[PDB]
Amino acid sequence: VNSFSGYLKLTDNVYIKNADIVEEAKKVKPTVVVNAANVYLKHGGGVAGALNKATNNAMQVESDDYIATNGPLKVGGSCVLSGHNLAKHCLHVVGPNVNKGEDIQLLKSAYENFNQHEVLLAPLLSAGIFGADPIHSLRVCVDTVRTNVYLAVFDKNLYDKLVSSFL
Numbered sequence: 001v002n003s004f005s006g007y008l009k010l011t012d013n014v015y016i017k018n019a020d021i022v023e024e025a026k027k028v029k030p031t032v033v034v035n036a037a038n039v040y041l042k043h044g045g046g047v048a049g050a051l052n053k054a055t056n057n058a059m060q061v062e063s064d065d066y067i068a069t070n071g072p073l074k075v076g077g078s079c080v081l082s083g084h085n086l087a088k089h090c091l092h093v094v095g096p097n098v099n100k101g102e103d104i105q106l107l108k109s110a111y112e113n114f115n116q117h118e119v120l121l122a123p124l125l126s127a128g129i130f131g132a133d134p135i136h137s138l139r140v141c142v143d144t145v146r147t148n149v150y151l152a153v154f155d156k157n158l159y160d161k162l163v164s165s166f167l
């Protein structure tokens with residue numbers, strides 16, 4: 001039993017809700033919140049910009065030190081950093097950005113990072129400003145993630161479409 005509330009159950013391990021991931025994280029304080037990161041951990045917009053703003057830019061300060069030490073992530077890769085005031089940990093995961101021409105096949109590799117954590121609050125990878133089809137992202141999530149994932153979908157119209165079209 002966990003503290004996530006109001007989710008629709010899609011499969012044995014995948015759950016979904018129309019919710020602002022920032023507000024959901026502040027309420028649940030999950031062990032892991034997933035960020036829709038880029039390889040530079042530059043949290044300018046989309047989910048990343050919103051999560052970072054909610055940390056009062058502390059996420060960005062920590063991320064800049066991480067990059068200065070380690071260099072950029074790989075597309076499809078991840079790193080674990082602090083969750084600040086939102087969660088115990090933040091798993092920064094880089095899905096392919098279609099608006100940069102990146103290989104959509106890397107979306108499965110990106111979701112594989114979730115399997116290293118028993119429970120996660122997450123957005124749909126590569127959705128929103130990353131330019132992928134969110135219906136496809138949900139399909140890859142369900143077919144790749146085996147741990148317990150609670151998906152927050154900001155847009156109510158998109159949420160209803162994701163549910164109604166789910167096979």
Ligand SMILES: N#Cc1ccc(N2CCC[C@@H](C(=O)Nc3nccs3)C2)nc1
Nearest residue numbers: 020021022045046047050127128129154
């Ligand atoms: N692509 C993409 C993408 C972009 C942003 C985003 N969020 C998550 C939910 C909260 C939202 C927020 O802070 N909205 C506000 N409106 C007025 C004042 S603050 C930001 N999610 C996905």
